[PDB]
Each structure stands twice: as C-alpha cells, then as structure tokens.
Amino acid sequence: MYDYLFKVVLIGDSGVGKSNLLSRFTRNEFNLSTIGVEFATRSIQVDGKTIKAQIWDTAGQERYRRITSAYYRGAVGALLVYDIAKHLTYENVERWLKELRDHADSNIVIMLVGNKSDLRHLRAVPTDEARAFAEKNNLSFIETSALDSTNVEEAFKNILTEIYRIVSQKQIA
Ligand SMILES: Nc1nc2c(ncn2[C@@H]2O[C@H](COP(=O)(O)OP(=O)(O)O)[C@@H](O)[C@H]2O)c(=O)[nH]1
Ligand SMILES: [Mg+2]
C-alpha cells in the first residue's frame, strides 16, 4: 500500500558507509554477503502519503568503477556518500555526481551525505566545505553517523520528502 514508490540509490566510494546507511535505515542494523546490487524497501509517511522507498546499494562495484548505468536507471534519488574522515572519498564526490547526472535521470534528487561524523578527530572534510559544494550544486546535504545513528533517519526521510514534494507537484509529462 503506497502512493509513491521511489528508487533511491546509494553511491560513493568504497568504505564510506553506504551499506550501513542502508542497514541502519531499513533494518536499524550496523555492521563493523553481497552478490550484487541489492535493495531494501521502507515505507514512510510524508504529507499524508505513503512513500515506499526502494533503496539500492552496491555490492562494492565502486571499488572498481564496476557500477553500471543500470544501477542508476530510474533512480529518483541518490544519497551521494563520502566519509568525513577520508578526503579522497570527498574528492571523488564530483565523479559520482557526474556519473549520476549522466546515467541517471535529470530530475534526480541528490543528497550529499558526509558519513562517519563520529570520527571527529579524523575529520578531513569540513562541514562548511561539503555544504558549500552541495549548495552550489543544488544538492541537499547532511552529515550522518551510521555507527551512532546520527541523522540517518533524517537523511532518508529528507531525500524522500524532497522527491515527493517535487514529483507530486508535476503533472504527467
Ligand atoms: N566510525 C564509523 N564507521 C562506519 C560508519 N558507517 C560505516 N562505517 C564502517 O565503515 C566501513 C565501511 O562501511 P560500509 O557500510 O560497508 O561502507 P560501503 O563500502 O560504502 O558500503 C565498515 O567497517 C563500517 O563499520 C560510521 O558512521 N562511523
Ligand atoms: Mg557497501
């Protein structure tokens, strides 16, 4: 029973916490076997509507750039994740963002997610820097800790709400 079914993909370098964002949001689980791209669904309510989120994650193909255009196909949202404690994963955001815009559809809602906010002492990516990038690129932005749950619920509820608010206003085209 749902009003909308939104495919949202997690993308970002290996080891940034994509899988744990997914497990935290959909199962409230964290892990310190995956045979392919996979998904979990969670229904949320936004504005009196049931939004069924179909949240996709990789099997680690991003270790290679073995991420196919098929993965992005039909995604109306992406959580573009980096690790606040690994600047390279943030440098690589531009590349994923491109890969999105490209292989994904023009109206995709993209939320930039700096994960592992618990790793304060290793912070290599200032919040201001990532926020500024997000703002310039019309991305939403949030920092999460899948470990401590910090902002996980919010990150996904926010992107689903964004997608809902956008799509629900648009007549068929
Ligand atoms: N400290 C900390 N570690 C995390 C967090 N999220 C994920 N990790 C760890 O980072 C590693 C990669 O996590 P994973 O979810 O597999 O990242 P993925 O490769 O992007 O899917 C694992 O050892 C996780 O336990 C977090 O919020 N904080
Ligand atoms: Mg993973």
For domain 3-173, is the CATH number 1.10.443.10? no
Query: What are the start-end ranges of the E strands in 64-165?
Result: 77-83, 109-115, 140-143
- Report the amino acid identity of residue 40: A
Compute the distance between CA of residue 42 and CA of residue 134 in angstroms, rounded to an integer.
26
The angle formed by the CA atoms of residues 140, 144 and 150, to the nearest 5 degrees, is 125
> Structural domain boundaries of the chain?
3-173
Which ligand sits closest to the CA of 96?
1
Task: Give the contacts of 68 (CB within 8 A, at least 6 positions apart).
Answer: 61, 103
For ligand 1, residues with CB inside 6 Å are 12, 14-20, 31-32, 115-116, 118-119, 145-147
Quick one: which H or E segment has residue 40? strand 38-46
- Report the amino acid identity of residue 155: A
Compute the distance between CA of residue 99 and CA of residue 67 in angstroms, rounded to an integer.
9
Whole-number Cα distances in Å, 12 to 91, 105, 111, 123: 11, 18, 11, 17
171, 162, 172, 173: which is closest to 6 by C-alpha?
162
The answer to whether the beta carbons of residues 11 and 92 sit under 8 Å apart is no
